[PDB]
C-alpha cells in the first residue's frame, strides 16, 4: 500500500546515484501524498531540479525548497501549508524521512533525511518515510555539507519519480 | 544579570532585590514623571528578559499604566515576529532557535536560552531588545500622566 519514490542525485550536474524511499501512506497519508506528488511532478511543479540547500553531516540533509532554493520557500500540493498529521513515527536513525516545517502545523514541501538518531525531533517534525535503497548515496551527500549547513557543491535532484 | 564570578567565570546573577526596591519605589514616588525612564535604564543594565519581568511584576497597582505598557510590549513582539520569519527545518546541533517576540519578552523562553542568545558570538541581545520595548511603553505612560 505504501508508495516508493526515487531521487537521482547529482553533484554539480554529475550523477552520484539513486535514493529510493518507502512512504508510510498507511500511517501519514496526507504527508506521504504530498511528497509522492511533488516527486512525480504530476501537479506541474515539484522536486525535479531542486537542491539540498542545507546539509549538516552528523545530523541531516535538507531539501525541497523548489520555489526559493534556500529554505525560505516551499509549497504543498494542498494550496496552503498543512497540519502536522500525527507524530506516531519516530526519528529512529539514519534514513528517516521527515518534514522540515517552519513551526507547528506549517508543512509545505521541505523535508530532511536523517544521517543520525535525532530522537529529540520527535513531536516537532512529522516522520513520513524512510530510505529503502541508496543509503550509501545519502552517506556520500553528507560529505558536501558543513556545520551550519552551507554546501560545498550544488547537490540536486536531477530526476525523481514513483517506482 | 549576566556577571562574572571570582575565578573569572560567566555566571547569571539574580536581580538584586535592592535594585528592585529602588525601582518599585521610583514608580510609586514619581508616579510616571519623566524621570522614571532614565531610572529604569540605570537600574536594568545587563538585564535578562527574566530580570526585566521581575522588575515589572513588582510594580504595585498602577494597573492601567502597566496595562498600557503590556500593550506596547505585545505590539513590539508582533512586529519583531513580522520582521524575523522563521527558516524551515530542524535546529542544528549546537545552535538555538531564532528568538520569537515572545521569547524576547521572556514568556516562551527560559533563562538559559536567554543567556545563550545574549552570550553568543555573534549575539542576539534579547535583554537589550526587550529593554527598548519597555522604554517605549514607559514613554507612552509618561506622555499620558505628565
XYZ file of C-alpha atoms in Angstrom:
309
model
C 0.000 0.000 0.000
C 2.945 2.276 0.662
C 4.356 4.023 -2.412
C 8.047 4.138 -3.306
C 9.693 7.236 -4.718
C 13.201 7.673 -6.183
C 15.599 10.585 -6.386
C 18.519 10.527 -8.845
C 21.049 12.674 -7.056
C 23.698 14.752 -8.860
C 26.708 16.759 -7.668
C 27.281 19.914 -9.758
C 25.433 18.184 -12.659
C 27.309 14.881 -12.367
C 25.439 11.683 -11.387
C 26.093 10.382 -7.875
C 23.343 7.805 -7.657
C 19.817 6.806 -6.726
C 17.991 7.031 -3.369
C 14.639 5.295 -3.051
C 12.103 5.854 -0.249
C 9.202 3.949 1.216
C 6.472 6.454 2.112
C 4.289 5.466 5.058
C 0.927 6.299 3.473
C -0.605 3.755 5.873
C 0.174 5.996 8.845
C 0.513 9.534 7.379
C -1.402 9.509 4.158
C -1.726 13.273 3.598
C 2.045 13.837 4.183
C 3.031 10.785 2.109
C 0.762 12.003 -0.768
C 2.246 15.469 -0.719
C 5.823 14.124 -1.096
C 4.768 11.493 -3.670
C 3.022 14.021 -5.932
C 5.927 16.551 -5.652
C 8.223 13.651 -6.685
C 6.301 12.769 -9.876
C 5.743 16.406 -10.944
C 2.076 15.486 -11.622
C 0.780 18.862 -10.225
C 3.008 20.718 -12.696
C 5.648 21.618 -10.103
C 7.836 19.753 -7.595
C 11.236 18.403 -6.689
C 12.852 17.724 -10.073
C 15.905 20.049 -10.477
C 15.767 21.295 -6.881
C 18.606 21.138 -4.389
C 19.637 20.019 -0.934
C 20.320 23.502 0.304
C 21.273 22.665 3.933
C 23.446 19.655 4.771
C 24.817 19.131 8.287
C 26.952 15.975 8.151
C 26.285 14.324 11.550
C 22.590 15.413 11.599
C 20.641 15.590 8.363
C 20.308 16.577 4.672
C 17.513 19.062 3.936
C 15.794 19.877 0.669
C 12.569 20.548 -1.139
C 12.545 24.280 -1.461
C 11.791 24.194 -5.164
C 10.464 27.784 -5.245
C 13.271 29.839 -3.497
C 16.073 27.170 -3.201
C 17.233 28.449 0.203
C 14.784 27.409 2.935
C 12.513 30.459 2.782
C 10.252 28.871 0.196
C 8.200 25.705 -0.305
C 4.691 24.862 -1.446
C 2.488 21.904 -0.721
C 0.032 20.213 -3.147
C -2.863 21.480 -0.963
C -2.804 25.198 -1.800
C -1.792 26.086 1.723
C 0.603 24.850 4.351
C -0.832 21.832 6.097
C -1.261 20.370 9.574
C 1.124 18.003 11.392
C -0.792 14.845 10.543
C 0.484 12.894 13.602
C 3.645 12.167 15.444
C 3.264 8.408 15.536
C 6.524 7.519 13.818
C 9.824 8.301 15.451
C 13.204 9.571 14.369
C 14.975 6.237 14.971
C 18.190 6.505 12.877
C 19.818 7.247 9.583
C 17.484 7.294 6.565
C 14.359 8.567 8.289
C 12.453 10.998 6.049
C 10.728 13.804 7.894
C 9.022 17.178 7.279
C 11.118 20.293 7.743
C 8.396 22.881 8.585
C 8.666 26.364 9.955
C 6.656 25.763 13.173
C 3.714 23.683 14.279
C 1.242 22.943 11.505
C 3.243 24.581 8.760
C 4.158 21.706 6.409
C 4.938 22.754 2.822
C 7.438 20.894 0.618
C 10.675 20.939 2.566
C 11.910 17.750 4.107
C 15.008 16.204 5.555
C 16.803 12.877 5.595
C 18.346 11.938 8.947
C 22.002 10.854 8.904
C 21.921 10.010 12.666
C 19.450 9.172 15.511
C 17.610 12.501 16.220
C 15.146 11.442 18.913
C 14.653 14.966 20.169
C 12.908 15.914 16.886
C 10.117 13.533 17.947
C 6.893 15.512 18.235
C 8.236 18.546 16.302
C 8.723 17.087 12.832
C 6.372 14.566 11.051
C 8.201 11.335 10.012
C 6.654 10.003 6.874
C 9.152 7.682 5.225
C 12.487 6.031 5.193
C 15.267 5.344 2.740
C 14.820 1.899 1.078
C 17.779 1.741 -1.339
C 20.704 4.074 -1.602
C 21.702 4.822 1.977
C 25.319 4.831 0.625
C 24.306 7.805 -1.536
C 22.893 9.758 1.409
C 26.146 8.943 3.255
C 28.075 10.393 0.256
C 25.848 13.513 0.234
C 26.588 14.327 3.853
C 30.283 14.936 2.764
C 29.244 18.139 0.938
C 27.771 19.894 3.986
C 29.121 21.730 6.994
C 28.379 22.855 10.499
C 25.639 25.374 9.885
C 24.557 23.715 6.611
C 26.158 25.518 3.631
C 27.032 23.015 0.886
C 30.389 22.980 -0.864
C 28.803 21.927 -4.177
C 25.360 22.005 -5.667
C 23.525 18.768 -4.670
C 20.459 18.372 -6.881
C 17.583 16.087 -7.536
C 18.387 15.555 -11.211
C 15.375 13.296 -11.655
C 12.640 11.884 -9.475
C 9.514 9.828 -9.674
C 7.436 6.971 -8.442
C 8.604 3.337 -8.747
C 22.045 39.920 35.047
C 24.963 38.114 33.381
C 28.051 38.727 35.515
C 31.393 37.154 36.456
C 32.414 35.007 39.472
C 35.704 35.241 41.433
C 37.529 32.738 39.163
C 36.766 34.788 36.060
C 33.723 32.723 35.066
C 30.462 33.787 33.394
C 27.501 33.354 35.687
C 23.907 34.598 35.666
C 23.136 36.586 38.803
C 19.541 37.020 40.100
C 18.297 40.596 40.248
C 19.311 42.416 43.388
C 16.169 42.893 45.461
C 17.805 46.207 46.304
C 17.748 47.403 42.704
C 14.120 46.083 42.706
C 13.042 48.018 45.719
C 14.648 51.239 44.335
C 12.705 50.805 41.079
C 9.301 49.963 42.566
C 9.668 52.949 44.815
C 10.554 55.317 41.935
C 7.429 54.264 40.020
C 5.342 54.835 43.230
C 7.029 58.191 44.340
C 7.279 59.800 40.902
C 4.078 58.052 39.669
C 5.110 58.301 35.995
C 7.008 61.523 35.821
C 9.666 61.692 33.091
C 12.440 60.694 35.479
C 11.304 57.004 35.699
C 12.838 56.290 32.285
C 16.473 57.090 32.971
C 15.978 55.323 36.293
C 14.790 52.195 34.564
C 17.750 52.241 32.157
C 20.163 52.864 35.082
C 18.633 50.055 37.159
C 18.388 47.437 34.311
C 21.953 47.356 32.979
C 22.849 43.817 31.811
C 19.298 42.518 32.493
C 17.948 39.309 31.007
C 14.295 39.275 29.944
C 13.524 37.213 33.099
C 15.085 40.013 35.250
C 13.074 42.678 33.378
C 9.820 40.852 34.060
C 10.738 40.523 37.728
C 11.102 44.291 37.713
C 7.749 44.917 36.061
C 5.861 42.247 38.012
C 6.769 44.012 41.265
C 5.006 47.324 40.364
C 2.190 47.543 42.855
C -1.078 48.698 41.434
C -0.822 51.293 38.667
C -2.926 48.672 36.826
C -3.976 50.992 33.972
C -0.405 52.145 33.334
C 1.022 48.577 33.478
C -1.632 47.532 31.025
C -0.527 50.345 28.569
C 2.946 49.013 28.960
C 1.923 45.423 28.267
C 0.037 46.528 25.140
C 3.203 48.161 23.902
C 5.344 45.114 24.567
C 2.820 42.957 22.721
C 2.759 45.259 19.647
C 6.556 45.275 19.521
C 6.754 41.482 19.903
C 4.378 41.100 16.962
C 6.453 43.470 14.881
C 9.580 41.546 15.718
C 7.919 38.295 14.503
C 6.725 40.014 11.265
C 10.305 41.178 10.510
C 12.054 37.903 11.533
C 10.344 34.979 9.739
C 11.485 31.526 10.833
C 13.639 29.475 8.454
C 12.264 25.961 7.798
C 13.885 22.860 9.196
C 15.187 21.266 12.379
C 17.507 23.187 14.705
C 21.076 22.041 14.122
C 23.348 20.635 16.855
C 24.897 23.410 18.947
C 22.515 26.072 17.611
C 19.380 27.633 19.083
C 16.071 28.529 17.505
C 15.931 32.138 16.415
C 14.035 34.039 19.087
C 10.431 34.943 18.594
C 8.950 38.140 20.048
C 7.532 36.167 22.981
C 10.994 34.655 23.542
C 12.452 38.132 23.756
C 9.746 39.238 26.177
C 10.558 36.180 28.378
C 7.147 34.389 28.074
C 8.155 31.391 25.968
C 11.908 31.319 26.672
C 13.964 30.011 29.552
C 16.639 31.865 31.408
C 19.181 29.508 29.874
C 18.003 30.159 26.279
C 18.089 33.937 27.093
C 21.689 33.640 28.256
C 22.605 31.567 25.182
C 21.314 34.253 22.783
C 22.961 37.064 24.782
C 26.419 35.449 25.119
C 26.542 34.019 21.580
C 29.012 35.267 19.066
C 27.500 36.974 17.232
C 24.912 37.682 19.990
C 21.200 38.273 19.784
C 20.894 40.847 22.592
C 17.452 39.785 23.787
C 17.758 41.816 27.054
C 18.626 44.981 25.224
C 15.900 44.460 22.656
C 13.225 43.811 25.353
C 14.516 46.846 27.331
C 13.929 49.079 24.283
C 10.322 47.870 24.031
C 9.770 48.505 27.741
C 11.193 52.015 27.443
C 8.815 52.740 24.557
C 5.945 51.651 26.825
C 7.306 53.829 29.645
C 7.359 56.745 27.195
C 3.699 56.152 26.443
C 2.807 56.122 30.132
C 4.833 59.278 30.833
C 3.113 61.068 27.918
C -0.266 60.100 29.417
C 0.340 61.007 33.072
C 2.625 64.090 32.848
